[PDB]
Design a protein around this ligand. Sequence first.
Ligand SMILES: N[C@H](CC(=O)O)C(=O)O
Ligand SMILES: N[C@H](CC(=O)O)C(=O)O
Ligand SMILES: N[C@H](CC(=O)O)C(=O)O
Ligand SMILES: N[C@H](CC(=O)O)C(=O)O
Lengths: 306, 309, 307, 309
Amino acid sequence: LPNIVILATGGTIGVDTLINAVPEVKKLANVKGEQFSNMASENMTGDVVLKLSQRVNELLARDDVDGVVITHGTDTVEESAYFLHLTVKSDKPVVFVAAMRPATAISADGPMNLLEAVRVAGDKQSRGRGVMVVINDRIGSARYITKTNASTLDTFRANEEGYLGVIIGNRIYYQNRIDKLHTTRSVFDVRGLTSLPKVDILYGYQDDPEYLYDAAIQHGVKGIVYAGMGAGSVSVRGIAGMRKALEKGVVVMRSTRTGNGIVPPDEELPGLVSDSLNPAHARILLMLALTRTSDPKVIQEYFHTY
Amino acid sequence: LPNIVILATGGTIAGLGVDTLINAVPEVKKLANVKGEQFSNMASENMTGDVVLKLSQRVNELLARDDVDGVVITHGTDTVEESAYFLHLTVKSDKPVVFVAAMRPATAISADGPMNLLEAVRVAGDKQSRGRGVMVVINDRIGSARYITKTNASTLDTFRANEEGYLGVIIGNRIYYQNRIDKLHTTRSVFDVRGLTSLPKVDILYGYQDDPEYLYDAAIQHGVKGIVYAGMGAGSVSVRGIAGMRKALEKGVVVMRSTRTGNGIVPPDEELPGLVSDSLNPAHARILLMLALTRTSDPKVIQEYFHTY
Amino acid sequence: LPNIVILATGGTIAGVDTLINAVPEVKKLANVKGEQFSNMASENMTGDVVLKLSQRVNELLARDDVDGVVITHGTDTVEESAYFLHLTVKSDKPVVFVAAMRPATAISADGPMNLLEAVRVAGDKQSRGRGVMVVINDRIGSARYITKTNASTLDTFRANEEGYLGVIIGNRIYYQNRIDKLHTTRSVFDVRGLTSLPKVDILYGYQDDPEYLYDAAIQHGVKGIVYAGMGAGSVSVRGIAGMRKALEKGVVVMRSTRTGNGIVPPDEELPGLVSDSLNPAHARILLMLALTRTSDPKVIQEYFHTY
Amino acid sequence: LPNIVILATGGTIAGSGVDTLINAVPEVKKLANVKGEQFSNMASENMTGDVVLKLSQRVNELLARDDVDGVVITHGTDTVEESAYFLHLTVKSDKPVVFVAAMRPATAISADGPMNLLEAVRVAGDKQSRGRGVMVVINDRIGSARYITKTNASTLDTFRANEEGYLGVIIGNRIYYQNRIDKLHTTRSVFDVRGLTSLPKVDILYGYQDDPEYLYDAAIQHGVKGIVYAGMGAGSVSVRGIAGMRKALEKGVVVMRSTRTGNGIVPPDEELPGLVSDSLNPAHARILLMLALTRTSDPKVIQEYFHTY
Ligand SMILES: N[C@H](CC(=O)O)C(=O)O
Ligand SMILES: N[C@H](CC(=O)O)C(=O)O
Ligand SMILES: N[C@H](CC(=O)O)C(=O)O
Ligand SMILES: N[C@H](CC(=O)O)C(=O)O
């Protein structure tokens, strides 16, 4: 049986309580619980996610550890997952798991989600696939998966990219391998860091205010992710705001509020384009990109390859 | 044939005048007596509430006439869901109001605008289309302004209502109506906007890890009357967000918690500040909050609005 | 508290009393009474049995002491049973089918929550006159549109193009749509005095599809054939020869699609009728019922565009 | 420029033969040096295994040439998923094989054929497109032959792989590769069909309430070597279906249980007759079963093929 470490951070899903709640896991692998933190995912911060990554990195460096399952809240799991997706230098399975219903709710999804997460983490076939998010019988890539519904069990989906695999009848069915750089082939090393560049997200909508750009600039942001209307389209007020941000060394990354798709290059508009990264994912990559460079051309390439 | 007025506002569907737009698809003249009218000309990302308000009042006027059976409005795809929903709540008529757009420029290979326009006119002129609320027609689909939204930045099939589906579809030049929205709208709406020239200011703040409290301060300091929160999950709020919302609530600003996810219900939660957006996404929530603010500041009333419109 | 009768037919969700005592939370949403109509895997549910279920439900709903019904059923053919009652239950009182994708003994079994939501929906006055519904995974689907789209997932039931009538979140019902089709109280499909149903089979459309299967169906007395066609009910040279032989022998031919969604449009250059947006399973149910009233192609075709 | 051969199997999907197609969309000549070949001319609902076999053999032949960098095959939408998956399993080359189709006729308003072809050629000539298995390009999407399927009878966006997504997309004239299928295909496939002129006969029977046992009897009587069952739910079988399958197995017929639902895994179950189709839908399952039968009749081996191809 593979050795799996379950790191708890909090979420609707103690760590031992969860382990004892589902004895079935012992039959899938030798599990050791570790309470990393205990907070709702809406409060997870880059600084803490950074420590999480460094901790997972040292655990995976150990010969006595074959994989890691991280319990996390559903609200921002896509952000934490994508962060480790880009910073964990190992092929060993790193599986995030969450639950849309509280552990006390009728028909709670937590028990089964955890069981599936451990099976995925302990399977030899799961190595070298990037960070994964397991829930509701699905295995989603950290780079594509996102919470699409505020309250449903089947909320996590990658509409255009699908799932890396699924777990049915206690068997794992791998469907895709992501065609992007990650983990062991990522240039983003943060083990020598304690914090990341500040990046905020501004929404795009009719009558969007120019002053929010001023406010962000004034508070020291090093980057601004724009959840734009359509394909990163910008109103005259957003353009004026982005212009001021650029004049002050702030990197502007145009994403989309739509939820899916490609924001294509447009030399007629200011800032960079987010490829298929949604706002939450784009912020994470921009923060990491800024730890290595400020060159817009280099940053743009990162977004087309990560 | 039914008398249909085509109001052009701009958009990729003409990326060109409304007349050149009609001549490009002569087939529409076989479906109805169309009258072209250039209301405005701008990319939808630049469409503003004051202009949308004027658009609604203009449509109200036209539909009040006996020589007008319906209206088709060409519009950019980026914010058509905002404009469409605005009229959904403000146009007091059962006559069809159909927004139409195109994801590909009119000059592009396999441009979708031509067929989209033809379908929109067919829908607007069909007597079976009455009393269904404002509609958005594109890619053979008919979506309700209250549910439809642009879900993809660049695909032809971008407009979808994942949980609510389409009101109907157009296949083989025939309309197939599937649903009737179970919400108040148009002739049943209390949102009278006759005579108005401006609307309360409402901003949308995003929710994410490390989300800053200063954005709330900035919005509050600039006189917004309401703040729509595109929150994490079911409108979940961080400590910074909670602090920010409290300041807003103290200054008398209405806080509406929506979601950044893209779909779903943000349920009530007395342990959290502000109101909840029901199934309205951030963009639609802002539109309804603005209109709600023209009639009341009472959190109770505004909340009921969000559960019924 | 509304009076809700729970009729069990079988299914992974679970006899009926065990189901009720298993989820006591239901008795807080209504005054429940269980009835074991039958017990079999839904793949074995038959038209004759569904017919009797519909008659029993009508009988039950005609009573003043019954406000609604919840029917537990297997997920495999619930769309067929639900649509049948959608067309035959002459009452506006809620009829809610409920099922479960995971066995009642599995960890994170979905059955308990599904049942609770089904009872809440069945007992809400706001749920009247919406046609037969299928409740599962926090969603409320119309029997006419809902279908099992996935072999094994919890979220399998979906109506891709038509969406859900509503959803249940945080113990609250959110109604989104009202189906724009005829059903229940406004349906002509009264089967009160029926004991049998016209034989209707489904033949698949694919490359190299055999004409002999049409011959076989004809030889075995089918009164109608539903074609789960390639694309928009497209037919190969072998399928068209088979359909023509069927038509020559008095069989009603209905062209549907194997795709899973969408409209099979009228086509004057192809034999048979078209199924509108009804999938093969639904199309068979409506065709069977239609045949109890007429053999008139024009009438049957109009049924398919309105029901 | 890359050298692309466009093989047509039916009518042109653009303008008003393969020559008409190319002359109708001259933009392709800027993406590659194209050469057209009229392989066949029939509606896809009439495409047969014998013909698809020749198609595969012809493609293998073309791809073995130095002067051919890739091939684009125009095909009807109705059965393109079947033809594409067959070549996906029998073309022994890593060079791109791109099936393209159109949901609207070439002479229709806003016909999709022109743009679809343009995207297909761009994909077929891109160095980055090698070794990805057979692809189906349409409506800005690149789908794997193993997962993609026509999900809607009449819409432009009909082709989707709900659980597996697209291999990539084409937006703004640029290809964005998202996934690589984790299954065996093309150069790693054991399905050698050179020399063959016909394929084992395989029929598909539907699963539904009251499904008849006599249909299994008929198939058996007509010498089918395999039966694909489009089962209720996860390949569930009624008492009649079980009786039918038992008879088939007694006659040496291989029974493969798939699902009529449209998506998902049909899991193994010892209490039921036959094999399970993994995530292959009926149409795909039939194709793989026919090819599996050209190698063996052993159930364990065929079952392994279904879990790896
Ligand atoms: N906010 C909920 C609960 C939590 O995080 O504890 C979530 O993200 O799952
Ligand atoms: N921004 C594009 C183009 C436009 O509006 O003109 C749109 O909204 O369709
Ligand atoms: N066949 C399964 C199990 C059953 O019916 O009992 C279902 O339909 O749910
Ligand atoms: N049957 C249509 C037309 C054709 O094949 O020619 C299709 O499959 O696209």
